[model samples]
Target: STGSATTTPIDSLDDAYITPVQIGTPAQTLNLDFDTGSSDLWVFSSETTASEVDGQTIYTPSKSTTAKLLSGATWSISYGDGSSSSGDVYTDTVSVGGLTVTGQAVESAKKVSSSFTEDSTIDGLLGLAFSTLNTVSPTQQKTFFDNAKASLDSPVFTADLGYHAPGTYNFGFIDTTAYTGSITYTAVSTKQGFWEWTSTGYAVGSGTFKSTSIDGIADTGTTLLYLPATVVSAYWAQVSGAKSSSSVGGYVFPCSATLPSFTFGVGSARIVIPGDYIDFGPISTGSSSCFGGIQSSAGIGINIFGDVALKAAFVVFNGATTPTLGFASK
Candidate 1:
């Protein structure tokens, strides 16, 4: 049987999408960020200090008969943005939408970084990357998708991310009705435990699309669009008031400046992100300064096509074969 769930962006942050998931015997519902960039199913739990948990919900394994500790097993993860979480491990039943996985490893956090503590709405993270990337010690654990793949009709999932709206994440099947036009497919490299692909290049405004090689990852958990420094420089050159702001970090421009559309090449297909999307609102309340959604990943090593880029099209994360990415206009 197939399964699906709706993900909602909280507070116009557009940084992450939270989906409801049920865990344990009686079903403890938690709001989790389904991230493709990392692997580990962890949540805020009773084990975490009350002071550190802030106002976030916590999972209590003692309340579930199915929850059993894997003696001595533990897990810790540090994200690219420096946020981290760590805890002991327990095996329990976890369900998402209509699909269920028995004996799935659930890492209950005893410690969390300041970033997570401040984001009280995010109770935990649901990793969708390969199980090989799981952080559990003594023995690594499998992700919910990995454990349930054999029972699924198709080993595929689709991410329909939205801007200031709610979107759906589909598993085991693709809904052709959700997307418009044909999906242009390309091979993906999962060596980095990410939906990594190469873009042919990008162009600013109505100028001719230039050809260059850009290796990047499609990360749902991140908020901005990060590209090579040269590309970012080229785009800003076309914007009259755009300048790299040390104070605000990255590039900033006048809120009233008319931004140009940016286009990226995927094989022969082109995905265009509109100008209005690049102006990521004002940098401060009632200010004329606005931060750019597209920035240079010069020191970050890898470019990230986060929500800013993904929201422009319908994305298919095909895990069936050599692992492919299919893109189409929403």
Candidate 2:
């Protein structure tokens, strides 16, 4: 039988989806972000300094009889958003859904950045990317999927990301009922330890899809869509009062501004992002304006097809063959 799990969204954030994972003996369950952009199963733990831990739950390895420490091993990670985490290691039975992987290397966080500490809802990150991206010292570790793939019916996982609602992350088997129409498959480049692919082009509103190529990652961890600066500029140009505000960060316009539909090209298929999704939310300063969800990927190396873009379609991260991506309207 195929191993499977379904993840649900936390309505408060809408930026990430969380899946239930059981770690160690006696089964301490936590809701972890299933991040495809990074490779690490690190979580907040009892080892974390008291001052560093806010309201977030922590995994106490000592309380679990099955937990074993990997002597002298440690890890540290700095994310694109500047959030960071580092810790020692433990080997334990980690399970998601009905799939169990024994002796999985689980990183226990002793330190975390302010960003992670404050966001209490996210317990840790369950990286679905390649194991090569794992950051364990001296010896990198394997991800849960890598360890369990051989046991799965098929080397596939489908992400049905939702907008302002719940979605599911199905592993081992693809459920045909989750999406509509036929899925379009595209090859991905894993050299960078990412689901990197080049979009044939894109179009703002109903305009023609410009043949410009966009090299990007389908990062489930990221909140918004980031594109080349020129492309971002072109997108905001269509908005009446859209402007890049250094204070607000990214582009901001009146909350009521009418937005156009944005479409991304994949092979011969185009995934359209509605304008309402582009208006991320209001700026933090309690302003009357809202920040644009799609922004400039200036310093970031590749364009990020983040949650804002991903939730528009049903995505399949296929490890079978050469790591391909399949997309269909949700």
Candidate 3:
């Protein structure tokens, strides 16, 4: 995961500005990191050693006037990248953004590694991404969305990325005006997380799109877009001076150019990922040769639509009513 500079976010319900959830009455607040990449909510605790508790707020369930640990339930997680943490389960009254939710399942990592333990600001993580990978077995017992939805003012939840500002990301009702009026909503499969989208078609170099195709889920968890090999190769074939290189982070190309944007149709909404994102990071990849934004997929199975794609649109996760995503270009 990208460190503190890059946020792993979460949303809060109610019109109330989201504040840290003070786990207990004596209350040391727990900063929630809402991550769609994975599903789980973990917070450092007072039981954690000082060495492992930097930058993280320790949750002392005992400090809560209303708290209870699940009888003999243990929680553990191992990320796809092999990063992992594990702990016992506790049910408590977790408070956030001036709202109180009782009997929430909180994972307390008993043996967290340096990557998580050292970051003092990272008190906990709340994953709402549509994966069965990190949820509690029954799936509906106490998800961040499930618990928070009861307290939220709306049935919709939105994510506003690229926040360089300090403090936790604001939550509550989704602000419709924060984005454009055109929202492309897709029906979610009854399946689990990871990209399970289909390509409707393609619009080359900012051209109008043909309804015949679409792409996989645009996820924030991935660093960049990973399209199908054939599409990747053919698209770059049109871009002047665009070439694939083995030496880079999988893909490389010229930094400077009038890169065109591509729009993925989710329904009525066609979100266009800007040209800048297509150019990859601003860092120099030498001098003339810089990393290209969109790259060829390593293969089809793991092909992805990364944050580069998500930031271009307004997305709403309607877990309160049904687990569906509504997409729009704003």
Candidate 4:
């Protein structure tokens, strides 16, 4: 009922994290992004158009003895990449780490966008968000976690993301040794199918801690930490040469600048993000300005505590009857 899986960063930027999940009777292992921002267990499959695939692995339902077609069922969902992926659905045995869930809905993508195809690092996404966000029509489908909930020792999962290294995804039980300090809990509202919670406040570098409530989601699927303009600007203002670059579409600074640390609150607990993590990476080859990992979410309409913040702590997605989130400094 309890299990854990290690996920590797797909690239230096921690652009995405991939966990190997076994699908089918013979167990076809495909590297999948465990996205908490969306709900759809879609994959690059045998049904995908040849032109849409690069070097990514594909899931072949026909080859699995335990695979069962979910007749008349189909799913569709749009992506940030400006395209939607859709295809038929199937029920199969899926395994992550050692936790097994039978009758899991596996949505096969017949098409994918260039962002996915060109990457060739991840085959698809395993949605860890609420099942209500599922795209399947006629009848909506439950997420892999939803189906596996009852079987879990506890209906929960945890994320321990690393800055530029492998992290962990644990189901059913929390590994106390994986983190430092006691975890502080906060109630989460899933009205929008996300792990949306409110932070107590924030502080820029070694400055004062502001007692402000900021609403955001803990999204591993996202790369950067996005907040309101006021918070983002305050953080960037501390770094010498930092500026909001029109050319780069976000804040940038001289690659050699000494960056400031960031701290956000979960209840009364304060989690600090080291300055180096905010340095992020260079905009492009031969670029002197490095991109800020923390940016303004004004354009996106909602704040996001993505990997940039996540990598600094251990996060618990407590899927209790009344869902809540728990954060611990690591």
Candidate 5:
């Protein structure tokens, strides 16, 4: 079966920036985010300051008679983006889209940054990325799959992210209707992430592609695709008036013209990155297209796929059973 995992950030309110997903019933909906970079589902709690969390979704545990916090457990998570949050652990009925999972493990942050504080529109995040990266400690851990696994008719939950993508983090039983043949499977190595691979090479449109010969990791935590400097510059050369311009500490194509499609080869599996995904603006800075195929990463040796590429197709993570990953079309 072909399945994909999409990494989407939770809005300040904790809700999906794109999809209209509601947690709990309409009467008491707690906003959320669906993140793949880390495997943990957390939200702001009443402990969070109202003014500080001006626009973010805050859950009133008292309102929910059924909400349960794990005994003597606390969780604090920091991201590569340099953002972090800390909170107590809890389990309650958490719903996504229209599906609901009871006793789902959740986090309640008492302290949040300004970026996470205010956002009524966003409520929380969903981490469908991988199991190894789960922020939830084993003592108080709860994965979406771990809670919903029994309800699923199949042993899989696929992420269909493209349509209203970059923000849409769709999840549910892997509908066999999304694929034609048996999905391709690859061994997953948690060396960096649940699924890390080396990029053989990259090419734009129908241009002649060269070998990158770089070992990189596929990350759901990141937001944009990363490549080597030579590969990115060479790619822009073939595009019409698409020169690399500096923005967001990375080079973004200055021209608004349609960028050519790019391709990435992973082992025997090949992925075609559409042009539209290349158009990114810094997170709210609008310095330029919010993207950089390659940038200086202190000493980090791996690259991340973010939500852009993961949304293009369905990704199946079999970490629970074996260190294997499978993908198919959504």
Candidate 6:
């Protein structure tokens, strides 16, 4: 069968999307980031250092009759942003929406970095990517998606992220009414354990589409759109007072600058990102300079179509042996 869940931006900035998850027997509910860029269903727990807990909810395994330690299983993860968390593993009954998965691997955080402790809105994270990205040792566990795919009506899930509004995550079937126009499907290469694809091209606001191939991963975990330096320069150059600030760490412009929209293509599909969404907001409280949502992926090694782009369309993550990606305007 299939299931559905509501995912909302953790806060007004839309830095990330979080969904409610019920773990253990008595159902300890926690808000978690449903990240498609990584694979590890980890959560804050009693084992975590009190200093690192902040105001986030924690999972107490002792309270759940179904909770059992996965002997000798340990895990640690570090992201490019310098954020990290490490913990031991436990198996328990976990539920998302109305769908339940028995003996799902639940990683209990024992320690976390300052970045994680500062983001109090996210209690943990649920990975939706391929199981090959799992970090657990001795016996790498399957992601919740991987374990549940077999029993699903269709081995697929869809991401409908919104801008300053609530959206949905649908499992097993596509919601025909969720988007406009027909979905344009494309091949997905998961050899590197990501929803990696080469986009058809891009276009600046009100400009002609450039016919060039841009390889990147569709990452919901990331909050910004990172493209080649040349593409990024083309967009910001049109904005008055826009400048690449070394101290600011990215391109920034006057808060009142006339921002232009960005458009990217998949097959013949064109998704236009509104200009308003490009102004991420002032770099600091009361500051007049605003940081851009689109940045150069030069040093990052790979391009990423993050939430800023994902929010403009509906994305289908097909789980067939030969996986495919589908995009539709919303």
lDDT of each: 0.89, 0.88, 0.60, 0.92, 0.58, 0.92
Query: What RMSD does each model have against the real structure?
Result: 1.3, 1.3, 6.2, 1.0, 4.6, 0.8
- Give candidate 4's whole-model lDDT: 0.92
What TM-score would you give candidate 1 relative to the actual structure?
Answer: 0.97
TM-score of each: 0.97, 0.97, 0.75, 0.98, 0.78, 0.99
Can you write out model 5's per-residue Cα lDDT over 135-177, one digit (the tens) per residue?
Answer: 6554747577657655655555554555343433334455566
| After superposition, candidate 6 runs with Cα above 4 Å error | none
- Tens digits of per-residue lDDT for model 1, 1-330: 688999998667576789999999899999999987778999999899777898887889999999999889999999988899999999999988878899999999999999999998899999988787999998999988888888888988888988889998888898899888889888789888888999888989899999998999988888889999999999989888899998888999888899999999888989999987787888989899888989999989999988888888888888875888888887
RMSD of candidate 3 to the true fold?
6.2
Question: Which stretch of 10 consecutive residues in model 2 shows the poorest summed lDDT?
Answer: 1-10
lDDT digits (tens) for residues 189-268 of candidate 4: 99999999999999999999999999999998888999999999999989889999887899999998988899999998
Better of 2 and 4 by lDDT: 4
Q: Cα lDDT for residue 61, model 6?
A: 99
- Across residues 1-330, which tens digit of lDDT does each residue of candidate 2 receive? 355566777655486788889998899998899998999999899999888888887899999999999988999999999889998999999988878889899999999999888878889999988888999997899998888888888988888888878788877988899888999999899999999988888899988889888999999999899999988998899999999999867799887798888899888899999998887667775777988988999988789999989999999999886799998987
lDDT of 5: 0.58
Off by over 4 Å in 4: 81-83
Q: Residue 142 lDDT in model 4? A: 93
Ranking by lDDT: 6, 4, 1, 2, 3, 5
